[PDB]
């Protein structure tokens, strides 16, 4: 146990050993077997972690002095025995990373650091009389263990996110991000690993580990904040920026081929434009993917949020290369629906419809349809959507002033200087008035929303929230304001709403009721 | 009278004393004006045709030329004598909003 471990450690680091070296080297197989037997059988020993750390230090000293560097004459068993013990320690570390029932925090979370420090020191300590950093075999074995290491259900976290494997999360914390070369060599070994058939039939499966590996805005190809190096001599790894981007492109598309689940579908759609689309040589390859995500018409009831998420990447792709989605404003008119105000992603869509409806080549009937439908949607809505709908209607009416007949029709005004025949005609036409707005029309220009009027905002002027009602008072106020800073009005939530309500500007004193609800308190007492 | 180009028109020019060409949407249509009636329509673009103009009698193999500019980068030249067939085009570095010739 700990006694034999510390004695064998002192013997291995003492001066030299041959038979005791053989015993303390074959003892690591026994330590691996004991940990593999106690896996989900003891789960609290820490002698296993001490044995891994001690065998790491012993093999580190053995790779310092007696490594399998080269040979001159008749040392044809010492190098084979030392490399055999080092390869068995590495294979035990890879089995230790692959075989773990759950987040046991020792057998994988220390074997990862063991294989990482082993390859980090084994950059040198070979025949390489140059500037190599060749871990490639050990690294390919590391990542195939890291993707075979399936835990219980923390992969594909069915609420949101990517994967909650503890050692993979620690890897993307401090063993993937903080440098340049090991992520590049990871992408290269990944895009060699996805080409032999058995490994690719296993590697298109657990994609969530890779989503957790990538969605972090801290890549070596991303020029926002760049890194340093820990490896002694990096072998033209940072040079081929084309090779990193091309590898990133092809493994992205090749594992986007495989077993799309809806949660990680929405995850890659949300990160599609701000995270990965600059790291593509040709981003037109994703155009088919997000155009079918945009016109996704599925029977699944939560498959109505994915057009709203495909819009950002698809519009950035159109803008960078002017490709066309036909019937664009018809599809954008049918995308607004009562789901879109109750959805989680409102500000992400409305800060894009800011750009879509500011176009100088569209019609007053089109903007009329887009605000009359939005008002009939906003009459049954949270204030989170009220306070982003009504300044949007303000800015659209301010940019298309012909749409102020929906707020103010001058044919329905009774001034005191009128003919009796005029007030007669006024009474007959306001009795023979019916509004022509039809919600089931698919065409914005063919919707009669200019010929209709806009009652929903006037009804909205009496709202339970004072800030919301005083914001809706501006449609009876004049229009001296030019615009409203929609990105300042956008993401007001229930939580931040009552946060600012508890942390408001002044503080009046509360009052009491003189109503005396003595017996009947509600109508329910 | 009224000529029902179905898309919202962006430009209307007059070629003959009789026929006029309206662009709007992905196509352009030509209309005989003595008979109130459409007779050609070319929809050879991806996005909306923003503008048109027309040339006559200039030193050219083409005796007449209608060129059309279309919000996707393209400006194309159509020959009114063989049924408004496209003969040449230029691609530009962004959406082309207006065009003209000498």
């Amino acid at each position: 146990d700990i006694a034999k471990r510390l004695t064998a450690a002192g013997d291995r680091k003492q001066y030299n050993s041959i038979i005791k070296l053989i015993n303390e080297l074959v003892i690591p197989e026994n330590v691996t077997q004991l940990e593999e037997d106690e896996t989900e059988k003891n789960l609290r020993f820490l002698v296993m972690s001490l044995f891994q750390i001690f065998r790491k230090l012993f093999s580190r000293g053995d790779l310092t002095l007696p490594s399998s560097k080269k040979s001159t004459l008749e040392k044809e068993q010492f190098v084979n025995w030392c490399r055999k013990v080092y390869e068995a320690f590495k294979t035990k570390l890879l089995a230790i990373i692959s075989d773990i029932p759950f987040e046991t925090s020792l057998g994988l979370d220390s074997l990862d650091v063991y294989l990482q420090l082993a390859e980090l020191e084994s950059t040198h300590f070979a025949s390489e009389k140059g500037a190599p950093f060749f871990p490639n075999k050990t690294f390919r074995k590391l990542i195939i263990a890291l993707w075979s290491s399936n835990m219980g259900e923390i992969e594909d976290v069915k609420s949101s996110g990517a994967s909650e494997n503890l050692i993979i999360v620690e890897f993307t914390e401090k063993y993937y991000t903080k440098f340049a070369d090991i992520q590049y060599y990871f992408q290269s070994e990944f895009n060699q690993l996805l080409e032999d058939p058995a490994y690719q039939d296993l590697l298109l499966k657990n994609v969530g580990k890779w989503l957790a590996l990538v969605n972090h805005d801290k890549h070596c190809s991303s020029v926002d904040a760049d890194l340093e190096i820990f490896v002694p001599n990096p072998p033209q790894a940072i040079e081929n920026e084309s090779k990193f981007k091309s590898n990133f492109e092809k493994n992205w598309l090749s594992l986007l081929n495989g077993q799309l689940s809806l949660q990680q579908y929405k995850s890659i759609l949300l990160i599609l434009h701000k995270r990965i689309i600059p790291h593509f040589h040709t981003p037109t390859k994703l155009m088919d993917f997000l155009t079918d995500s945009y016109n996704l018409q599925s029977s699944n009831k939560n498959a109505g949020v994915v057009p709203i998420l495909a819009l950002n990447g698809l519009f950035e792709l159109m803008k960078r290369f002017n490709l066309e989605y036909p019937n664009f404003y018809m599809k954008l008119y049918q995308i607004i629906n009562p789901d879109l105000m109750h959805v989680k992603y409102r500000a992400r869509f409305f800060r894009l419809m800011d750009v879509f409806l500011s176009s100088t080549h569209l019609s007053a009937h089109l903007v009329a349809s887009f605000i009359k439908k939005l008002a009939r949607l906003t009459l049954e809505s949270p204030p989170s959507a009220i306070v982003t709908v009504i300044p949007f209607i303000y800015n659209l009416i301010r940019k298309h002033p012909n749409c102020m007949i929906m707020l103010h029709n001058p044919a329905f005004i009774s001034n005191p200087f009128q003919t009796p025949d005029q007030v007669a005609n006024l009474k007959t036409l306001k009795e023979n008035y019916v509004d022509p707005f039809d919600v089931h029309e698919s065409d914005p220009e063919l919707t009669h929303a200019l010929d209709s009027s806009l009652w929903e905002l006037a009804s909205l002027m009496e709202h339970y929230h004072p800030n919301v009602a005083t914001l809706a008072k501006i449609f009876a106020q004049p229009f001296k304001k030019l615009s409203y800073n929609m990105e300042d009005f956008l993401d007001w939530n229930y939580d931040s709403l009552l946060n600012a309500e508890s942390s408001r500007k002044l503080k009046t004193l509360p009052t009491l009721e003189f109503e005396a609800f003595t017996n009947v308190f509600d109508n329910e007492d | 009278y009224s000529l029902n180009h179905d898309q919202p028109v962006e430009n209307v020019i007059a070629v003959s004393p009789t026929q006029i060409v309206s662009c709007g949407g992905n196509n352009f249509k030509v209309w005989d004006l003595t008979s109130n009636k459409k007779l050609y329509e070319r929809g050879n673009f991806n996005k909306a045709v923003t503008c048109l103009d027309y040339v006559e009698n200039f030193d050219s193999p083409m005796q007449s030329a209608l060129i059309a500019s279309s919000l996707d980068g393209h400006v194309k030249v159509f020959d009114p004598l063989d049924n408004f067939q496209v003969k040449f085009g230029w691609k530009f570095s962004g959406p082309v909003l207006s065009c003209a010739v000498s």
């Binding site: 598309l253 579908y265 994703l286 993917f289 | -």
Partner: peptide, 17 residues
């Protein structure tokens, strides 16, 4: 859902239109 590849056929279609 998709299960075929990420192709380039919208690009090709509005190249040939």
């Amino acid at each position: 859902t998709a299960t075929t590849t990420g192709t380039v056929t919208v690009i090709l279609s509005q190249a040939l239109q």
